[PDB]
Amino acid sequence: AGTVVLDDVELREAQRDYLDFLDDEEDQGIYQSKVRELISDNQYRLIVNVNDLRRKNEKRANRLLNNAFEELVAFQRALKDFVASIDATYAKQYEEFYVGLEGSFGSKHVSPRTLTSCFLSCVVCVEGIVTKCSLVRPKVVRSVHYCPATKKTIERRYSDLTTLVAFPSSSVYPTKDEENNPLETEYGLSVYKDHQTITIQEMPEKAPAGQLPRSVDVILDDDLVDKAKPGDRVQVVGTYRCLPGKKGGYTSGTFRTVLIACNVKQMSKDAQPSFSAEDIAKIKKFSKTRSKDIFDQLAKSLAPSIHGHDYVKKAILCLLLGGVERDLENGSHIRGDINILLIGDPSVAKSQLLRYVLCTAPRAIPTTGRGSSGVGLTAAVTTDQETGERRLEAGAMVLADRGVVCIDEFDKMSDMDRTAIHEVMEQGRVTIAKAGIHARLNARCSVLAAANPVYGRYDQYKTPMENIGLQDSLLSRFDLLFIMLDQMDPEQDREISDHVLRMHRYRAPGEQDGDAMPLGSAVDILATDDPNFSQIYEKHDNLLHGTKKKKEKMVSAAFMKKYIHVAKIIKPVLTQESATYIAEEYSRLRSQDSMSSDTARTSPVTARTLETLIRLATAHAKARMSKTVDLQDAEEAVELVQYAYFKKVLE
Amino acid sequence: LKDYALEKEKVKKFLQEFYQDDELGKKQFKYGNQLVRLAHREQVALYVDLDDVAEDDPELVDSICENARRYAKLFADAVQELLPQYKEREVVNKDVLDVYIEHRLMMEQRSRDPGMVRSPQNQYPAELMRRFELYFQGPSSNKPRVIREVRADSVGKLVTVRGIVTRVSEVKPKMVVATYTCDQCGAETYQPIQSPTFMPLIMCPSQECQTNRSGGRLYLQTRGSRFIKFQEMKMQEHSDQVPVGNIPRSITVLVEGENTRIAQPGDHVSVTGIFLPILRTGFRQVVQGLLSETYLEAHRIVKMNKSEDLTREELRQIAEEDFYEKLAASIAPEIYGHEDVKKALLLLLVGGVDQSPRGMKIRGNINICLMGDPGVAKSQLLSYIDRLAPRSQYTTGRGSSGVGLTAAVLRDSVSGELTLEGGALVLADQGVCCIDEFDKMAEADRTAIHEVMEQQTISIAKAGILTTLNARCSILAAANPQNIQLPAALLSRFDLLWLIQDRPDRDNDLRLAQHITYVHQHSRQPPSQFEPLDMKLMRRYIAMCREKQPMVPESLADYITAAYVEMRREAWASKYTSARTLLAILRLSTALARLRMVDVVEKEDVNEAIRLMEMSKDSLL
Amino acid sequence: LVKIPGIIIAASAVRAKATRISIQCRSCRNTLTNIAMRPGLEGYALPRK
């Protein structure tokens, strides 16, 4: 055999401390519950909060952070022992239970640039964007061979010597028996582990301006291989180590470094929100007690900082809630995504509304008229340059799939790009193809666009068709088109100015002392935890300088986010009464005689107008948590479309 | 562990004593008859159905699904052992490899010395003398997996996936057993190839040369060797099964033997096979370990869900005179109205008869261009036709442009050569190419489409490519607006240019709104007198029509000429018509006759063709 | 020791170089810890015994 340790004092102490920490039963069983949850979910990787670990035993936390491999092995042994104690069969099912880390890393939290050799063999939490990924390959961790000549069955094991001294003996795949009998490998019986290599680059918006970006190579293994794709703003918690070179004889002293990832995370904004019992109870209470005016309350509480534009705010809320897709048995599809175009006079806060949607709605992609040009906007087809094979790169729409694309300077956008996105706006999919590849990417995103009317400022004395240079083909697929006019009414100016000045004079309680400048400079960002991958919530915003007073509260941002997320899943069904009402209203709307004279249509009326009527009714039902599209929902939809589709020509 | 001799006996027992009533209710030895056939060398591929196996031995099915390669070899060896006792006569030596096998067996018998024990390596390899191949058919209880989810945890298992075929190499000979002949003794040497590469042998290990201690340099040659039809394809996930924001994932499928030439790029396929690795030596492995590629070895390829490769009920349905209208109304039942448009689309899906009179082809394809205002369901119609037709390519404005429509050149991997890969038109070579936003399509793309319409080919004379492609597809363009935009370029080419103007109207708009709202209520069109045909039935009927070439009797010659002359006079008097319009008449009438499933076109078909043509023409006004 | 003025036109990424290496014997698994590495772009030949 060989050397076998008997009394490793450090290993015994580490195992004891980690098992004590994982007991947690007296410590409100946080990690007991986590272990039980992973057992039920059939997972074999425990994510541990380093902050809790440090609180329990700062010594163990420091030892783990500064000595990665040894302490991680001890932690995994303790986790396997705990899993066996809770349930032995599962522990025997899974050979090794891995431990990934999470929380606030004081100094270990770095970027690919600040990640220097001082962090070798330490636990580092590096932020960045995945520049490239590799195919998921299986590495044999235990091979099984059968010898026909002797009917024997052997099993060879290969250890994970990724960042350890490896010799030819350990990495030789048997191909003969001791008597030179050919073997045959039993692939089914053999054990493989999935392995992938990615590249994390410093975020361009974080990198020093004008310099080339700093990268790092990351190794992912079983249960972490496909946690990211190129262009993902990922946080990788791992162990930084030097990769061994090939058996040489002369060494230059240069060692490639790599990050053995122990955990991968995406932007927490798109993550599944945590709904506690009290939170769901509050949502139930809100929906039940207030249903008649809940949609109006949410619409008015949507963007507190932007005054007026009540109809536009309601339309934006409908866009956020979305409709419901129709998946017909014969494959025909109907989008449930509302498209909104805000056009009007300069300085009407349309860009502010788009920015608010970007900040709030999950999977919201900003874009500018000329910022994205075709292949950048939709998907693109390139070549690997190393394999000679075609490859697909997701554009803004694809990345915004099941989300929102907030486009600004839509008018400035070239006609080619608008023609290209025509398909996305209605079918919600991108159809690209080159000679060696063809795909139909899913882009189920709602387009919220902003534009400036021709002549810079809206012309009250010209038809909306002439004011808007967008042709009918592109106008139709916009479900709602709102003309936001900078009317010069003295009273509206009074209200707007009062709101703006109040918002400017507001200061955040506690953090601001009356003279602080909150800007930081490229260091505090890494010093403190990133508020982009981080881990009690009220319902109505407490009175503050934002508003003076009234008998109508304003919904909290977090509560509104949770409520919208819950309500978006609802798929209210269209009732016969609402269906008949919508059909008759669509007939009347299409019949031009209904609308008065001196009134010009913003956009043409079409079957798509009917479809957006249905979608708006569905969105109102979702807001109400109704589960059925009712007469009030149909009324609100018809009201909104009637307001949006007609504008009075002044003279 | 398991005793593979016992497993071989189990598979022998199953293969011998499994019976089914498939043959017209009569009990039959499903696999016994196949064994007889391939012992006579009348069949090559033996597809063992794991549902059949599980009918009496579920544990064997589980073991196969866990170690499919091992049991694949067990089944192949059992078949080979059983063949001699099922042979009932002498084969006719249909193949040179059969000649080689006959000679090898005869000479082994001649130098048998039955009692003597020959060394384990002094024997013909199993693969060298098979002339057959055993594949599986995955058990129906195994839910198909997603290419993304097929990972290292299921290597060596038997799994079935479904997806779109993107890239498919050609069929080329892959060495399976390299045969060498010595220059001193006169024996043969056999190297069974398993790795992607092999190092040819130099010295002959035959007994005679070993005794002589002579040179014994042996010569690799293809005559006595054992090749197998080989292909390598890329299979792509389906759009509906891809995650929210990701792109579809690809898998490599290695097809061998009789599974070749089944799938072609653009096909929707389901492939069942074993998830196996390829050793990845040769590179400067950055990370230590035995890393390997991944691939699916094709055991069962089945085109499905768009291009799947009769009954008294369907015969009666065809015999019904309103079968034409039934199919038309079944085309996109959700879309309200557009009855004549849907009838034209059905005529497109059917197509006319191809003509080859004295060295020039008058193609029978039907070209239709849907001009219309926004929101008249042109895109929906084109998408539905794409889903319905067997070989359908739906190309939007510019995402698939240039080489997205025409072929390009890409480096290969099996040969490292420059292979010509087809574009959308070639992928729809003999089907339907639904072009959307044809007006906004690029100029080069529009010229390519014009050329394919006029010739069914695509000539290219660029730098890296110089070829004359073949794309015998029918163009279904959907442009938007001489009204306001009615190019003579489109008029002169499209056999049916339809204008779809939606003037507001209380009654029609209300009916359409009720249709739409019921559709959104029940995920289906409102119930009608006639239930629309399922896509499978529509495809079956259309395919049966396609092979029903009706001819034009000389009696209708004067009738057609009179109609054409009358249309010419009307067009001349009014404020476009030509031989292209006459050929449109001819092929539309032929397609209507084909739909009726007769051999001779009739005045009713001619009248319907003229009626559709006049509806299209006066849609302009 | 020279002193030179100039303008930088490139700056590679901060790689890792070894000041002290350790080596192990494949057969007897004995170590030769803390072998000093010459500073600068200077290599090192492994022992052959």
Added chain:
DNA sequence: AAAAAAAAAAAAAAAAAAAAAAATTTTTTTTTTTTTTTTTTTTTTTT
């Protein structure tokens, strides 16, 4: 019964064969990374 001669025993030194031990970096390849270039294609400007 003792002394003288013979022979044996014990012990040490030397030689021959056979198994063991010691010594033993340079040269070439080649892969990856970077840059260069030719053509195709796309965008912008002008009439």
